[PDB]
Amino acid sequence: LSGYNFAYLDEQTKRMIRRAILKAVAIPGYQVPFGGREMPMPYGWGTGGIQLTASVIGESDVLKVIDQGADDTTNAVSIRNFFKRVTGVNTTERTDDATVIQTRHRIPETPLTEDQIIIFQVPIPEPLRFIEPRETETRTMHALEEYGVMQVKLYEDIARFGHIATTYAYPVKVNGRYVMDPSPIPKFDNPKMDMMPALQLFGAGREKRIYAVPPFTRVESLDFDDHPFTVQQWDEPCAICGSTHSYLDEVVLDDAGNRMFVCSDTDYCRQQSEA
């Protein structure tokens, strides 16, 4: 009732995005070009995720928008308010109660179930972009599956630091064929993508690329036998819920240096605290 078309997108744009989504699902990991439009949010602020959600969201869907894992983050609040205005759908902060989840840099700690769709917001939908800035070159690299340069960069990082310098947006091989980067999620979240029961959609509006991982697909982070894939670790538990299995974030309380670590996933923190 906002005066715009449902989900704010005209029908032909929705059809184009839906055809792109189907193609992406048919080719897990491939970045499908799509003619994205300019949304009320600026480019780089989640336009791709917004367009994907508008293309998939329906009247009966329950939407959960989270930023940095928190539902109350400024960008999450803005996007959720926009979707409430242009669709009027029900919104939730509980992962298990959401049928569609739009997330910016986290995979919820709560495992996802069947029939759930998680939309990822991707700034750079190209794992090789920081290696080879040219799209004309990375495109052929993907076409021929010549990913040796990624291994070269990983080995250079090991040589320079003794560790993989990459800590988020860690590249992952999908279905044994495509190296893609997920959203800029930590290495902590990469394991959650393997054999997930929920369809995963990744959209980059600024770069105009849509790709996806169907449910129950192999997503293996790139690593070596000598350097097994590690995950972020902390010596502290959550200062609120006391959980030791969640991605913690640092909160500086005063200039003196006092700080507290709290679960990034606020819904999971609330669930743990109420237990």
Partner: protein
């Protein structure tokens, strides 16, 4: 013991209220009208229309007012508004020869058929801050002359008839539309021109400047600059004939560039083209220079300077994308930075002795 409070929406609302109050400014001064911006800040409006994609002066002025004068924000507002509107028709190709000139200058000949019509312009003005504008005065009455526009042929028509340049032939190729499909490099000249017209004025100006300073020179001459009103026509489905729907104030720049010597014909000048809305020449000139620069593959030229690199030039030309992505860093990134801190703290501890 801490507890997570919910204070995002209230902060957002307060920030937006503060921004709106600041935009209104002091309430003693009357709120400036959109018509006032459209009439008296016409050059900003021209830039906003050109880079926003809609040639509506009132909408561009409204975007400027809503954006507090920020050209980038106004451009994004207009571009976002483009999405909501539906495409009713596609105009028949513009015939710039029928332009009702307000300004026509050629830098390649002392005089030309139709004369050097300077028209409104800041050129040849001494840029001294005019403090009489602090208190409103009255504009002087305009002197007049004969009210007839003698024929004003394009200078490149004159050059081509001499054989010194080549006519731009229409092969019937369907123009590319980046607004419909994402750009794919290499890009046809139609898509390159469409992207350049939507590109940022400052970026294109810097690239053209770099080409003029030797980073892949193209030896440009301002063959002709025209600003005037071009009629717009469409052929509706329900009517079998073209109908004239109005006229747009547009600026057209055609640049003579360094001549080549094709293997099987006489040497001739190469040319570049720029076309914008309003009376902002420099954007059209930069468009023409960068258009010629990006023509390197067609002429088999080596990309010497960055302005000749098509992917680099066009991937960063779009003002909306550039501004939005540079601004995305204001968003919270404490998850990624926490990952980086975890890695760094470990690297430091490994070499702590």
């Amino acid at each position: 013991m801490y507890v997570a409070v919910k204070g995002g929406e209230k902060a957002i609302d307060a920030a937006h209220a503060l921004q709106e109050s600041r935009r209104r400014g002091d309430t003693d001064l009357p709120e400036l009208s959109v018509a006032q911006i459209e009439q008296q800040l016409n050059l900003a409006v021209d830039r906003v229309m050109t880079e926003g994609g809609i040639a509506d002066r009132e909408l561009a002025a409204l975007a400027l007012k809503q954006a507090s004068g920020d050209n980038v924000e106004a451009i994004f507002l207009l571009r976002a508004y483009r999405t909501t509107l539906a495409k009713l028709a596609v105009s028949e190709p513009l015939d710039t020869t029928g332009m009702r000139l307000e300004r026509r200058i050629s830098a390649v000949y002392k005089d030309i058929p139709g004369g050097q019509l300077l028209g409104p312009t800041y050129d040849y003005t001494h840029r001294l801050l005019d403090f009489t504008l602090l208190a409103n005065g009255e504009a002087p009455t305009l002197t007049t002359a004969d009210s007839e526009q003698q024929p004003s042929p394009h200078v490149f028509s004159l050059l081509a008839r001499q054989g010194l340049a080549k006519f731009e032939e229409d092969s019937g190729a369907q123009p590319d539309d980046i607004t419909r499909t994402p750009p794919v490099y290499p890009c046809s000249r139609s898509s390159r021109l469409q992207q350049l017209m939507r590109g940022d004025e400052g970026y294109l100006l810097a690239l053209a400047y770099s080409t003029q300073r030797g980073y892949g020179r193209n030896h440009p001459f301002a063959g002709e600059i025209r600003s005037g009103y071009i009629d717009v026509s469409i052929v509706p489905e329900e009517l079998g004939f073209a109908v004239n729907v109005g006229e747009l104030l547009m600026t057209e720049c055609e640049m003579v560039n360094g001549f080549i010597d094709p293997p099987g014909e006489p040497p001739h000048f190469t040319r570049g083209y720029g076309l914008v809305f309003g009376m902002s020449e420099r954007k059209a000139m930069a468009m023409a220079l960068v258009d010629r620069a990006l023509q390197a593959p067609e002429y088999g030229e080596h990309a010497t300077g960055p302005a000749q690199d098509e992917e680099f030039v066009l991937a960063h030309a779009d003002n909306v994308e550039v501004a939005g992505f540079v601004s995305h860093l204001k968003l919270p990134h404490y998850v990624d930075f926490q990952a980086e801190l975890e890695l760094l703290k470990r690297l430091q501890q490994e070499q702590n002795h």
